[PDB]
């Protein structure tokens, strides 16, 4: 009230709220180890117009090996801060690797322009992943200039995100198509890079890998080295079921889930349940002591 | 009866408005806190608050 | 084998009576009215019906929009698998789904799918009734998937349902089994369709083609081209479209009603 | 090399992009389609052999 005198009556002031006692962890089980050596230590990389893709699921992820191996600069992330990657389980992992020149690296961003963005590789605008590239001259550049690395220059329209075009046919820039005679007024859409180890930093071959993620909704498939914890009930605690954190009280249920169901969502679409992903039992998840306090004085 | 109905309807509007991006990345406060650096998280939380 | 001796007729059509509700998520909800946008079966449609019981063997190359409600007013497990491709001539990968008596083959291969994968043998004349013939293809190259599953032993009652997610990475199938009866040939009613599998084939999928048994025994004389028996079955196939639906969940947690906000002004009024 | 000032006009190449006697129309950056759909400033044409 901001005073030293109060009148007869009853005045509401602050609020009370029990605090949780502990946190628990309840994951499915354990996996193995992710094949980052296979992805980062390939003999040669694919060319951009035929970029590659690899799937990752069912292995234990890590970051310190990437920091242990060769200097991997230009390590930039969208929708994640790289450090906390280890402290979050993600399903749907994919890794796309290829090689370009040192310049068009600036073009790898969600929403861009340029030959690569339009005709070789497009990222979705809501791309929620992370890009990693590095120069590689002792590997790709040869004295005569490596010409095994090609790219596409011509196309009627730009690509949609995560698409590739391996079709090879003469582009007809002007009208009156020359129809496979490869004469002038017609272009071979593909060209090749010259990688003499003399061009300079603006033309060195750079190895690029992009790791794409997908929001955690479907049961997860990759995780980190955090251990599950024993289960306790009937106490306002901090739970984490399979990356689903919260704080409140859990109870054994009366409900009946179909084998494909997992939680309680209510009218406001908020959780009161988990099926124990070790014992497969339905628990109803509900907040604890809430309230606001009133004081009576004469 | 009308009085009772009108009041409840308005309250439901407030309850449902909790779930709306309001021009941000997530509706769950804990999820905005997660997968985001303090600086960026702060400005995303700021959006939700307004 | 060029199996001929089959007649040409226009396709069968019939009406879709609200038979197609796929639970779209794992959320155990109940006693609620969760409105939700989702590609689905537009209620009431003069949709097609390849009618294959002369001998009426209708099995043409059917394209893929986005998923197929696939009913079998039948008796005896003839319809088995399907292909799923854009050229099907080993020049590209294709999906292949085969359903034998024992395991499923989801071979994503550059395979020249030539002729029909028919199950002729049917040694019922020799008291065996074992059918076997593999004209599902000719060759199998660069196949990146195959799933030997749990080994099992293989009126009208096999009304199947098979929503097939064009979106790759997760080829989920929404389905139900139904003991159907009387020769209503397409019943009215309302039934659920839980999602089933999840396959990162990642291919451009384009055209399925049903794989089926043929009954070949003493009562089936003649060279392969005509030497078989038909057996009674019929199947209905429907495509989907993107709509917005309103679902009504009982206390037991079961989807029990729905409303398509896109059919009539009366409906839309409800939907608001 | 003569350097002719071109200004206060419209740069119609309708009888240019479609003419047969062209052999070396080497345009760099500007696609020869949107020659009309992009603008420029004071023009200066090097005319010579
Ligand atoms: C539905 O009936 C119409 C009207 O007779 C007919 O023309 C059409 O072939 C049927 N099916 C389709 C494709 O709408
Ligand atoms: C696929 O098989 C063909 C035929 O043997 C072969 O030439 C080609 O290299 C194979 N491709 C891959 C990616 O294995
Ligand atoms: C799928 O196949 C069709 C037919 O060949 C083709 O037009 C389409 O571009 C393909 N999809 C993609 C993503 O290329
Ligand atoms: C739901 O479950 C209860 C309890 O088993 C059962 O009595 C009832 O028949 C079921 N169906 C409905 C619609 O209540």
């Amino acid at each position: 009230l901001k005073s030293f005198t109060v009148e007869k009556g009853i005045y509401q002031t602050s609020n009370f709220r029990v605090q949780p006692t502990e946190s628990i962890v309840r994951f499915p089980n354990i996996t193995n180890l992710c094949p980052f050596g296979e992805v980062f230590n390939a003999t040669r990389f694919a060319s951009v117009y035929a970029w590659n893709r690899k799937r990752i699921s069912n292995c234990v992820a890590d970051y310190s090996v990437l920091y242990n191996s060769a200097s991997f600069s230009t390590f930039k992330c969208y929708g994640v801060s790289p450090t906390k990657l280890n402290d979050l389980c993600f399903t749907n992992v994919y890794a796309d690797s290829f090689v370009i020149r040192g310049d068009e690296v600036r073009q790898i961003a969600p929403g861009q322009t340029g030959n690569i963005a339009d005709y070789n590789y497009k990222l979705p605008d809501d791309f929620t992943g992370c890009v990693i590239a590095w120069n590689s001259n002792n590997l790709d550049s040869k004295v005569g200039g490596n010409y095994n690395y090609l790219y596409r220059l011509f196309r009627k329209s730009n690509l949609k995100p995560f698409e590739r075009d391996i079709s090879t046919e003469i582009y007809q820039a002007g009208s009156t198509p020359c129809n496979g005679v490869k004469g002038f007024n017609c272009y071979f859409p593909l060209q090749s890079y010259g990688f003499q180890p003399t061009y300079g930093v603006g033309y060195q071959p750079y190895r690029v890998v992009v790791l794409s993620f997908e929001l955690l909704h479907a049961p997860a498939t990759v995780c980190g080295p955090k251990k599950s914890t024993n289960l306790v009930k009937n106490k306002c605690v901090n739970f984490n079921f399979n990356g689903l954190t919260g704080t409140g009280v859990l109870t054994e249920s009366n409900k009946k889930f179909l084998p494909f169901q997992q939680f309680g969502r209510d009218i406001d679409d908020t959780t009161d349940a988990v099926r124990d992903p070790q014992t497969l039992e339905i628990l109803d998840i509900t907040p604890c002591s809430f309230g606001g306090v009133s004081v009576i004085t004469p | 009866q009308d009085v009772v109905n009108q009041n409840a309807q308005a309250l439901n509007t407030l309850v449902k408005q909790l779930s709306s991006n309001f021009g941000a990345i997530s509706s769950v406060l804990n999820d905005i806190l997660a997968r985001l650096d303090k600086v960026e998280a702060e400005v995303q939380i700021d959006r939700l608050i307004t | 084998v060029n199996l001929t001796t089959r007649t040409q007729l226009p396709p069968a059509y019939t009406n879709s009576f609200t038979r197609g509700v796929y639970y779209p998520d794992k959320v155990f909800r109940s006693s609620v009215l969760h409105s939700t946008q989702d590609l689905f079966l537009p209620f009431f449609s003069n949709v097609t019906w390849f009618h294959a019981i002369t001998k009426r063997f209708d099995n043409p190359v059917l394209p893929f929009n986005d998923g197929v409600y696939f009913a079998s007013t039948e008796k005896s497990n003839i319809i088995r698998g399907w292909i799923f491709g854009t050229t099907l001539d080993s020049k590209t990968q294709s999906l292949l789904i085969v359903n034998n008596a024992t395991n499923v083959v989801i071979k994503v291969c550059e395979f020249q799918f030539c002729n029909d994968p028919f199950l002729g043998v049917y040694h019922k004349n020799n008291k065996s009734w074992m059918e076997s013939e593999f004209r599902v293809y000719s060759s199998a190259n660069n196949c990146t998937f195959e799933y030997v599953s749990q080994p099992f032993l293989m009126n009208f009652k096999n009304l199947r349902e098979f929503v097939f997610k064009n979106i790759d990475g997760y080829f989920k199938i929404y389905s139900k089994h139904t003991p159907i009866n009387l020769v209503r040939d397409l019943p009215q009613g309302f039934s659920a369709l839980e999602p089933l599998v999840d396959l990162p084939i990642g291919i451009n999928i384009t055209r399925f083609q049903t794989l089926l048994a043929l009954h070949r025994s003493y009562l089936t004389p003649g060279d392969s081209s005509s030497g078989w028996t038909a057996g009674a079955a019929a199947y209905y196939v429907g495509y989907l479209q993107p709509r917005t639906f309103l679902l009504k969940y009982n206390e037991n947690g079961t989807i029990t009603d729905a409303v398509d906000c896109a059919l009539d002004p009366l409906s839309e009024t409800k939907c608001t």
Side-chain angles (χ1 to χ4, degrees), chain A residues 55 256-257 260-263, chain C residues 23 26-28 194 200:
Chain A
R55 182 176 176 86
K256 297 184 291 294
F257 281 29
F260 53 89
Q261 296 152 355
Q262 193 170 4
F263 312 98
Chain C
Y23 277 70
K26 320 248 95 184
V27 170
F28 172 73
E194 16 89 77

Side-chain angles (χ1 to χ4, degrees), chain A residues 155 159-160 162-165, chain C residues 85-87 203-206:
Chain A
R155 208 176 183 279
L159 276 301
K160 296 179 182 179
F162 296 132
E163 292 176 351
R164 59 159 69 95
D165 199 9
Chain C
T86 314
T87 179
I203 77 171
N204 187 359
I205 295 172
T206 303

